[PDB]
Amino acid sequence: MNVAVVGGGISGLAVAHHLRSRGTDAVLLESSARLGGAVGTHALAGYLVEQGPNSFLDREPATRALAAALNLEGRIRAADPAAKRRYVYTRGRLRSVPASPPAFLASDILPLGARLRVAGELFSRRAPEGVDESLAAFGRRHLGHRATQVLLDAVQTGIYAGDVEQLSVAATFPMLVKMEREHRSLILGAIRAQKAQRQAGTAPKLSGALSTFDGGLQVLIDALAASLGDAAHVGARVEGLAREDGGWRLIIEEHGRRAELSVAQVVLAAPAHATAKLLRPLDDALAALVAGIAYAPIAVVHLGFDAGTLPAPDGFGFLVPAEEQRRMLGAIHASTTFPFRAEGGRVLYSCMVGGARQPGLVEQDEDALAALAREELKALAGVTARPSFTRVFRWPLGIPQYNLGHLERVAAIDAALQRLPGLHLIGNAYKGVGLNDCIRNAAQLADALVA
Ligand SMILES: Cc1cc2nc3c(=O)[nH]c(=O)nc-3n(C[C@H](O)[C@H](O)[C@H](O)COP(=O)(O)OP(=O)(O)OC[C@H]3O[C@@H](n4cnc5c(N)ncnc54)[C@H](O)[C@@H]3O)c2cc1C
Ligand SMILES: CCCCCCCCCCCC(=O)OCC[C@H](C)[C@@H]1OC[C@H](C)[C@@H]1C
């Protein structure tokens, strides 16, 4: 009847919250001095700066249901005004990526033949049978070379900060592969799905807008921490678990000393590496599978500027293609996107450095990373002004990379867990990277847990 949750990030918090709110007592244990994991918002120099994640697309019911059952729905905030535009640095300058098919055809985002090739997606050849094809392979077949080389690579780097050649399209973009399976052409599927909904309320309708909370994403975690209370233990590192008449025994280190705990079922919300260490003495082959999940390191450089030292930049931000051979991945554009996250007309840039193709840059110190960010923002965006604020967050264990073979690996992980009753896994490593995905998967697990 009692459950233990290892890891105090969103995956773990949401699982623990959903279990309690359905009549199942849960205990959560977190290594750090604080809950949240990657998610964290800091109040510094008149700004609200984000540790990692900045926003979520307001299109997931599970994250709405979580916000409702936590009295947060009125604190959600439009990714406000300014540019709905986004930019890609390609061929010498920042270029607006168009939002509509007619605008795209007249755009200069790609050369004429390359634009016409995207329209030729209607004649996309069949997908390779029984092959877990790469995102880049998917791109060349559907979109043409230029579109995948500049546009698809941008979307990819914006979400996973990874290698477009290594990422599995089935694991990273499941709805695109499903679309492909059903209609071959994506344009065809869009035309047909548009016809389907056109041929016939009660609660509302989700906008899909880029959203956050009024005090940043910290609002969600502070609301989770408060909802769990004494069930959420901070500075409690689990460093062992074993069987015991069904059931499970956790070895926990809290206030410098050793402690033990017996529970009916265990839920592991820790990153792949930390979870593998725990699974090792239990099943070496399963631990190997979990340990095989690659992570791309990433560092975020925040650069704040005094009101009037530079103009407010247009749009949600810009991304830079790997082929441009640059040391930065892109920037937001946070003050523009969410005005309330900056006071007194100050302008905030949140630059992203590293990814799967440049993991070595994240090892450098904070002053070197700040220097890097300024040089690139000068060469690409034309920002010459001196920053009045500078804050750097490094994640050596960054974003999990859903590379080729990932989907069959998660299947092998699932099959191995069935031989170990009462043991469960969630987290960004497995079946979704974003906040929305973690929240959804967390709720689904908790529901299925009451069996
Ligand atoms: C730079 C960056 C930007 C991002 N931007 C976005 C974005 O804007 N939109 C979006 O949707 N997503 C974004 N994400 C992705 C998303 O934030 C993460 O994938 C997600 O928050 C991970 O949550 P998690 O709980 O699954 O893992 P984690 O947050 O890492 O939680 C795992 C926790 O377990 C703890 N732990 C480890 N070992 C033990 C132990 N043995 N005992 C107890 N506890 C342990 C760790 O301390 C950690 O806190 C971003 C990620 C990064 C890093
Ligand atoms: C789509 C919702 C996010 C899904 C899960 C991860 C998304 C968060 C990306 C992690 C950060 C990341 O590593 O990529 C950099 C993000 C860049 C800077 C921004 O992407 C949109 C803007 C144009 C700007 C260039």
Coordinates of N, CA and C and ligand atoms in Angstrom, one line a residue, residues 6-11 29-32 36-39 52-55 236-238 269-271 274 298 399 427-428 433-435 438, ligand 1:
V6 N 12.2 7.7 -6.0 CA 13.5 8.2 -5.9 C 13.8 9.2 -7.0
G7 N 14.0 10.4 -6.6 CA 14.2 11.6 -7.5 C 13.1 12.6 -7.3
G8 N 13.5 13.9 -7.2 CA 12.6 15.0 -6.9 C 12.4 16.0 -8.0
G9 N 12.6 15.6 -9.2 CA 12.4 16.4 -10.4 C 10.9 16.3 -10.7
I10 N 10.4 16.9 -11.8 CA 9.0 16.8 -12.2 C 8.5 15.4 -12.3
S11 N 9.2 14.5 -12.9 CA 8.8 13.1 -13.1 C 8.5 12.5 -11.7
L29 N 12.2 10.9 -2.2 CA 13.5 11.1 -1.7 C 14.4 11.8 -2.7
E30 N 15.1 12.8 -2.3 CA 15.8 13.7 -3.3 C 17.2 14.0 -2.7
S31 N 18.3 13.7 -3.5 CA 19.7 13.9 -3.2 C 20.0 15.4 -2.8
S32 N 19.5 16.3 -3.6 CA 19.8 17.7 -3.5 C 19.2 18.4 -2.3
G36 N 13.0 19.8 -7.5 CA 12.9 20.4 -8.8 C 13.7 19.8 -10.0
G37 N 14.9 19.3 -9.6 CA 15.8 18.7 -10.6 C 16.3 19.8 -11.5
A38 N 15.9 19.7 -12.8 CA 16.4 20.7 -13.8 C 15.6 22.0 -13.7
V39 N 14.3 21.9 -13.3 CA 13.5 23.1 -13.2 C 13.8 23.9 -12.0
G52 N 17.1 25.7 -16.4 CA 17.0 25.1 -17.6 C 15.8 25.4 -18.4
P53 N 14.7 24.6 -18.2 CA 13.5 24.8 -19.0 C 12.9 26.2 -18.9
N54 N 12.3 26.7 -20.0 CA 11.8 28.1 -20.0 C 10.3 28.1 -20.1
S55 N 9.8 27.2 -20.9 CA 8.4 27.1 -21.3 C 7.8 25.7 -21.6
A236 N 18.2 13.4 0.8 CA 18.0 12.0 1.1 C 18.4 11.2 -0.2
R237 N 19.7 10.7 -0.2 CA 20.2 10.0 -1.3 C 20.0 8.5 -1.1
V238 N 19.3 7.8 -2.0 CA 19.2 6.4 -2.0 C 20.4 5.8 -2.7
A269 N 12.8 7.7 -10.4 CA 12.7 8.9 -11.3 C 14.0 9.6 -11.5
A270 N 15.1 8.9 -11.1 CA 16.4 9.4 -11.3 C 16.9 9.4 -12.7
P271 N 17.9 10.2 -13.1 CA 18.5 10.1 -14.4 C 19.0 8.7 -14.7
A274 N 22.3 7.3 -12.6 CA 22.0 7.1 -11.2 C 21.1 5.9 -11.0
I298 N 24.9 20.5 -21.7 CA 24.5 21.9 -22.1 C 24.7 22.9 -21.0
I399 N 20.8 16.8 -21.6 CA 19.5 16.3 -22.1 C 19.7 14.9 -22.7
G427 N 11.0 9.2 -16.0 CA 12.0 10.2 -16.2 C 12.3 10.5 -17.6
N428 N 13.0 11.6 -17.9 CA 13.2 12.1 -19.2 C 14.0 11.2 -20.1
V433 N 11.0 13.8 -23.3 CA 12.0 14.7 -22.7 C 11.4 15.9 -22.1
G434 N 10.3 16.5 -22.7 CA 9.7 17.7 -22.3 C 8.9 17.6 -21.0
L435 N 8.7 18.8 -20.4 CA 7.8 18.9 -19.2 C 6.4 18.2 -19.4
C438 N 6.8 14.3 -19.3 CA 7.1 13.9 -18.0 C 5.8 13.9 -17.1
Ligands
LIG1 C1 18.9 23.5 -20.4 C2 17.6 22.7 -20.5 C3 16.5 23.4 -21.0 C4 15.3 22.8 -21.1 N1 14.2 23.4 -21.6 C5 12.9 22.8 -21.7 C6 11.8 23.5 -22.2 O1 11.8 24.7 -22.1 N2 10.6 22.9 -22.3 C7 10.5 21.6 -21.8 O2 9.4 21.0 -21.9 N3 11.6 20.9 -21.3 C8 12.8 21.5 -21.2 N4 13.9 20.8 -20.7 C9 13.8 19.4 -20.4 C10 13.2 19.1 -19.1 O3 13.3 20.2 -18.3 C11 13.8 17.9 -18.4 O4 13.9 16.8 -19.3 C12 12.9 17.5 -17.2 O5 12.8 18.6 -16.3 C13 13.6 16.3 -16.4 O6 12.8 16.0 -15.3 P1 13.0 14.6 -14.6 O7 12.3 14.6 -13.3 O8 12.6 13.5 -15.5 O9 14.6 14.5 -14.3 P2 15.4 15.4 -13.3 O10 14.8 16.8 -13.3 O11 16.9 15.5 -13.6 O12 15.1 14.7 -11.9 C14 16.0 13.7 -11.4 C15 16.3 14.0 -9.9 O13 16.7 12.8 -9.2 C16 17.7 13.1 -8.3 N5 18.5 12.0 -7.9 C17 19.5 11.4 -8.6 N6 20.0 10.3 -8.0 C18 19.3 10.2 -6.8 C19 19.4 9.3 -5.8 N7 19.9 8.1 -6.0 N8 18.5 9.4 -4.7 C20 17.6 10.4 -4.7 N9 17.5 11.3 -5.7 C21 18.4 11.2 -6.8 C22 18.5 14.3 -8.9 O14 19.1 15.1 -8.0 C23 17.4 15.0 -9.8 O15 17.0 16.1 -9.1 C24 15.1 21.5 -20.6 C25 16.3 20.8 -20.1 C26 17.5 21.4 -20.0 C27 18.5 20.9 -19.0

